[PDB]
Structure 1
């Protein structure tokens, strides 16, 4: 808690993260688990590929370790694979980089832990329940005693929001003003939205944190971008930068594709074998987490709003009528139940129904038919609230398309309310497709917008006295 011992943002963000991952110990364990998952996916995969003798395992009493080959041979069998050794070297370099960042991160988090205990006085035991609210108000009271910022008024913390959410307000305003290509017109489908984890990572790596980004400090925009002139040369430089970052993405495509493959397998294939309908449930759509966001909104406030409003949204996706069918169901149930009631009364009367070549099969098929129809027959006295569903979901979200409020029941509303609330399976598919799709969108659809991106960052970037360079809307 040394005074002005650092820029405000890399300190405040860490403080917030420590509050979120409830405490230093929890956070440390979480990071360690995150590192062990990567290493386990890679090592389990390379063990399955390289060391196991599938033939003996399958056909040719056999104990499990009868399959595995001895290490003195596994090392040679994995080493004589140029492709495998190359993938493992790149994987190990990424891993070592992540482990080094982890060590540096915990050495910097012990400082935030001491900050809490000694200057905020919130022990790690009282932290899962201390509440964000407690600390955010509290630090502001600490600003008097344990001084921070060389020249600082007590933190309104309004600013503090700004520190934690500087680049996220920029993403919110970029997506809000329709820069950043998301909408695509696919043949055979409507206008798809393709916004993933990797794509937003690339957008932030291009714009905010890198070698030659728009920002030099993490709290100050480079000096040329504030100048009205020379906009065209800056646009050309940004276009070339994003071209080469897209080409790096295109070259790293195979490795990230392989990664998205295995982790998912383990992550989902289990769920598929258990409950194949868990992937039919719907999730709140990375595009949609950025669309339904609200000014200077920390992650936990957005997620509280998003799950307060989740069950109304599932009831909506669930609700619409399909009425003509209903009639087909009712009448098919009538005719099938009639023929089945006759055949059932006969088989009850004499019990020699059998020996008819198709009888028994007829009773079974008719039973299936009646059950399907009765499932399609709506339950009577089942209430319907189209108006309410397109009202309570909004009450939890607070943002709406202006052409949804009237026609809540149409396919236009469902089709674009779907993208915001889209189902897990298309989420897993869309995260699989991002390695192969992100470079081409990055090269083709964003490079034309570079001159508009430059004008955004020149026009909408205010210098607020305490915080530095923040988005103009987030004020």
Structure 2
């Protein structure tokens, strides 16, 4: 609750994060769980690779620990692996860096916790329900009695928004004005959109937070980028910077692939064995979280809009079905149900046609076939592909391509609403492919745009008196 002591963007961001992860205790536990998941993936994997004797486990009454090798031997068997030891050393260095960041992260969050309790007066018990609007009302009312900020200017409730969302408004405006290569023309497919978690991380590491970024303070643009002249040397410097960051990505490719290959397999293989159709459900597409997002919109407001409008969008995506597939389903159901009805009447009649060594199995198969076809056979209604279903999905999100409103029922509309709707299997595939795809897009497709990026940041960056250097659109 101190008198404007440390850079603001961070203080406010931390305050917001503490409100989101409902309370200090919850947040601390969440971070600890995040650290234990990494360590568990890595240690479980290195235990499966190195310590388990699969041959004895498989064939050659056996108790579970009959497989495992004693530690006095596991250490030697894992140590005589140069590749494994190297991956483990890099993994442990990343881990130690994350644990050290966590330490302070909590040493700096105890300060926000005391801020809440003593200056805002919202106990951690009343915080999951304290709500954002009131807190906003609390912080802005607190600004007076207790000194905070320069005091040159009193808070105005949009300052806090700019502080929390400075770099995110920049991402919104970058993606909105078609910088930042996302569209690609793949052979054998339409124009794909490839925007992942790692790619946006790299874009922010290149532009916003790094050793030689565009920003020096986290609230002020470096002095040269405001100058109209020397734009070409700045463009060359940015191009070289992004070249070398792309090369670091290309060199780290195997390790992130491993983790990506690994964590992912673990994450959904359970779900696959349970309900293989959970991966057929659709999610709201990182490109699409950035496209449908307003300028000064905190994460919880975007996500509230995005799930208020989720079931209309699933009703839309499921409303168009192939007639042909429908006809094939109907007739395959007829022929399979006919052969099965005959075989069922026989097994009912005598019961020794049952479990024909061949028949029983087919009966099931044929049963699987009839069930699949009946699932593909449409049932009555839901065929609208309506202007109206769109007319409600839009009412939620509020943005649509302008060539969508008329032809809501075509393959052009579905195909590029498809890109926003993101069925997950692809997400998981698209997050797997990002280690190997992000360096080459970063080296080839973005380096030509560096001279346009420089002109964006020079042209669209306003200095607002209290907040510093913010995007020009987010005003």
**TM-score, with length taken from structure 2:** 0.93
Mean CA deviation greater in 318-327 or 9-18? 318-327
Q: Cα RMSD (Å) of the superposition?
A: 2.7
TM superposition shift of 1:258: 0.7
**CA shift in 2, pair 1:250/1:329, >3 Å:** closer
CA deviation vs aligned residue, 1:5-53 (integer Å, no higher than 9, x gap): 1121110000000000000000000000111111111111111111111
**Tell me, which stretches of 5 or more residues in structure 1 are unaligned?**
none
**CA shift in 2, pair 1:163/1:377, >3 Å:** same
Mean CA deviation greater in 133-142 or 221-230? 133-142
CA deviation vs aligned residue, 1:155-175 (integer Å, no higher than 9, x gap): 112111000000000000000
TM superposition shift of 1:379: 2.4
**CA shift in 2, pair 1:67/1:12, >3 Å:** same
In structure 2, distance between residues paired with 1:137 and 1:58: 64
TM superposition shift of 1:376: 4.3
Mean CA deviation greater in 351-360 or 457-466? 351-360
| Count of aligned residue pairs for this structure pair | 475
**CA shift in 2, pair 1:377/1:232, >3 Å:** same
Structure 2 residue aligned with 1:70: 70
In structure 2, distance between residues paired with 1:341 and 1:255: 55
Mean CA deviation greater in 32-41 or 57-66? 57-66
Structure 2 residue aligned with 1:291: 291
CA deviation vs aligned residue, 1:202-251 (integer Å, no higher than 9, x gap): 00000000000000000000000000000000000000000000011111
TM superposition shift of 1:56: 1.3
**CA shift in 2, pair 1:359/1:59, >3 Å:** closer
Structure 2 residue aligned with 1:179: 179
SS of alignment partner, residue 384 of structure 1: coil
In structure 1, distance between residues paired with 2:337 and 2:414: 35
C-alpha contact 1:141 1:154 (8 A) present in aligned 2:
no
C-alpha contact 2:320 2:383 (8 A) present in aligned 1:
no
In structure 2, distance between residues paired with 1:365 and 1:65: 39
**CA shift in 2, pair 1:107/1:407, >3 Å:** same
In structure 2, distance between residues paired with 1:252 and 1:145: 51
**CA shift in 2, pair 1:368/1:89, >3 Å:** closer
**CA shift in 2, pair 1:344/1:47, >3 Å:** closer
**CA shift in 2, pair 1:237/1:360, >3 Å:** closer
TM superposition shift of 1:72: 1.2
**Tell me, which stretches of 5 or more residues in structure 2 are unaligned?**
none
In structure 2, distance between residues paired with 1:363 and 1:198: 49
CA deviation vs aligned residue, 1:123-156 (integer Å, no higher than 9, x gap): 0000000011110111000000111112343311
In structure 2, distance between residues paired with 1:123 and 1:110: 13
TM superposition shift of 1:81: 1.0
TM superposition shift of 1:384: 2.6
Structure 2 residue aligned with 1:154: 154
CA deviation vs aligned residue, 1:87-130 (integer Å, no higher than 9, x gap): 11111111111111001110000000000000000000000000
In structure 1, distance between residues paired with 2:410 and 2:371: 29
**CA shift in 2, pair 1:354/1:87, >3 Å:** closer
C-alpha contact 1:462 1:472 (8 A) present in aligned 2:
yes
**CA shift in 2, pair 1:346/1:73, >3 Å:** closer
In structure 2, distance between residues paired with 1:215 and 1:312: 41
**CA shift in 2, pair 1:68/1:370, >3 Å:** closer
**CA shift in 2, pair 1:422/1:57, >3 Å:** same
C-alpha contact 2:385 2:409 (8 A) present in aligned 1:
no
Mean CA deviation greater in 192-201 or 57-66? 57-66
TM superposition shift of 1:380: 3.1
In structure 2, distance between residues paired with 1:287 and 1:454: 23
SS of alignment partner, residue 463 of structure 1: strand
**CA shift in 2, pair 1:368/1:252, >3 Å:** closer
In structure 1, distance between residues paired with 2:217 and 2:453: 20
SS of alignment partner, residue 419 of structure 1: helix
In structure 2, distance between residues paired with 1:63 and 1:364: 36
Matches within 5 A, 1:18-33: 18-33=18-33
Mean CA deviation greater in 167-176 or 385-394? 385-394
In structure 2, distance between residues paired with 1:378 and 1:443: 47
In structure 2, distance between residues paired with 1:345 and 1:59: 43
In structure 1, distance between residues paired with 2:341 and 2:59: 52
In structure 1, distance between residues paired with 2:356 and 2:120: 85
